[model samples]
Target: ANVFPRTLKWSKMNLTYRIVNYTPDMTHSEVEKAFKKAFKVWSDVTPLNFTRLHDGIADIMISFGIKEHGDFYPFDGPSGLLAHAFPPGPNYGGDAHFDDDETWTSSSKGYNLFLVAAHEFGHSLGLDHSKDPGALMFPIYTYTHFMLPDDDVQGIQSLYG
Candidate 1:
């Protein structure tokens, strides 16, 4: 089991995001589109402002790989350790990582990237998981998929609301 970090900081201003395409499973444009939808889900709900630009660099960089991309924490293959991201630090802190071993889809393939990314982005934006399963910040990534529960609204609003 992964003893994850609970570190994340909130921004009183703006947050930018970009995704690095490493998954051969999806085309660059597809990945971008998928991530865009995922990124917008959180931004649309809160007072936080997120900008996605043509520039290659980003405050929140999304990447995919298996074990040792760069961070000390490595992803578990197939199952366990689905994905992780920093709470909100510097260049390397807001970055998010995913295990390519799992079948990722814009649809409900294996796990929903949008849902998981939203949660991870919450951590990136300085929110911790709530004991209430309804919250999007719930460490586990199932509740947000079907619906954005009330606790999720509570958690997100606590900082960005």
Candidate 2:
């Protein structure tokens, strides 16, 4: 079930995030913008709100790593793992890591940062991978717009509302 475990959901509506580092595939400004946009995907659905912090730990931390960055799940070079994020909590929880070896972009030229971040943020919130093909929480990823499917909305609303 992709549904969020009640304990995994964020405790508060307003949350803060920080980009621990960035990937060269996109400019610093572009990276920041893409994240803000991706985070917005869920905030639009629930009472959640996200704010970015320049220097400090936050509710969520984001980074792009080549391999063996810090976590046990070392990222594959360019294909295997696009990105990963932890469930909401303190410290490592809610942190998102992107595979820096992969090419990323805001547009569709390469892998879309917005698209990947959008899904990872879902995990950051609480929900696991959904079996529904159209669901944002689905393990299989493809480039698409922002609107999430019913599976995702219901899962999140159930967790937060």
Candidate 3:
């Protein structure tokens, strides 16, 4: 069975991330929990371990940004682009940015933070969009429930199996 495929895998297994900001859509604790679960999605399958840093830059800096945030890849309003992240490397390489414009949510309705963060974190770990439509790495966003799909599991294993 084709498990996780390989790509810009991080040079280290112990990774750190800082939640730079939170969306108004969810409470601070709720947003924290959403990301915590999201990170666990990959950590459960790979040797990767993630910790949150209250201050300073972690390996992957997580935050919510508006259309013209500091980054060049500004998100469109509402549902166009849910979130984005950088590939593994250095300086902003593994950071994840969610669109503040979207009504992010912890439930099935609205944009699910866990689902979107998990997908962006895949990029943070150096994974690109997968060809498999069922994959969490698929470029298009879907409201599928949060379970690591078979194709995605295979893909991550290939990088860190």
Candidate 4:
């Protein structure tokens, strides 16, 4: 049975995220742009408003690396675990990490940063993987990652509601 949780209150208007910009294929500026675009995907749907700052200090700090990056969860390199994020809460929370070992792409050749970032940001805003295949929160990465499907919209809306 599908158990739809009650919608929660959303009073926050500000979120600061910094892209570590460590992809080999894409430059720092390119990666930053993709991240901003991904955020736009979410902001366009809900009342969530995020401000990207030039300052190094940010609530959601994006980084790329190997093992033990100060968080409880560490990167495993290459494949298996691509990336992860902390649930929205306090300091250090809402941050996102990416595995630098893999090839990332804005196109179809490599891992799509825009898609994965959006998915990670969804988790940062308190969304879990949806059981539905059409959901953006689905555990699998290949489905509709580039496209924000109906299930993803509903799930993210539920969080902001």
Best of the candidates, lDDT: 3
| Cα misplacement distance, residue 30 of candidate 4 (Å) | 1.6
Query: What lDDT score belongs to each candidate, Candidate 1 first?
Result: 0.73, 0.88, 0.90, 0.78
The collision pairs in model 2 are none
Clash pairs, candidate 1, are 7-87, 8-87, 8-126, 9-126, 135-152
Per-residue lDDT of candidate 2, residues 53-135 (tens digit): 98888888888888899889998797878999998877799988999888999887778988899899999999899999899
TM-score of every candidate: 0.82, 0.93, 0.92, 0.86
Candidate with best TM-score: 2
What is candidate 1's lDDT per residue for 1-161, written digit by digit as tens?
A: 87544534654558787776567666777677767776676777787777776567778888898977788889878878888888777778678898898777677578777677777777777766789856777777662234566776676666665
lDDT of 4 at 101: 71
Predicted candidate 4 versus true structure: per-residue lDDT over 1-161, tens digit per residue:
87534532224767777765577779887798789888988888888888876668777788887777777788787777888988776677788898877688888767888888888988888887899977777888882335578888887877775
lDDT of 3 by residue, 33-127 (tens): 99999999999999999998999979999989888888889889988998999999779899999999999898888998999999999999888
Residue pairs of candidate 3 with colliding backbone atoms? 3-154, 3-155, 4-154, 4-155, 4-156, 4-158, 5-155
Candidate 1 has a TM-score of 0.82
Residue 142 CA error for candidate 2 (Å)? 0.5
Judge candidate 3 against the unseen true structure and give its global Cα lDDT, from 0 to 1: 0.90
The superposed Cα distance between candidate 4 and the true structure at residue 40, in angstroms, equals 1.0
- Candidate 1 deviant stretches above 4 angstroms: 1-8, 54-56, 143-146
Q: After best superposition, candidate 2 residue 77: deviation in angstroms?
A: 0.4
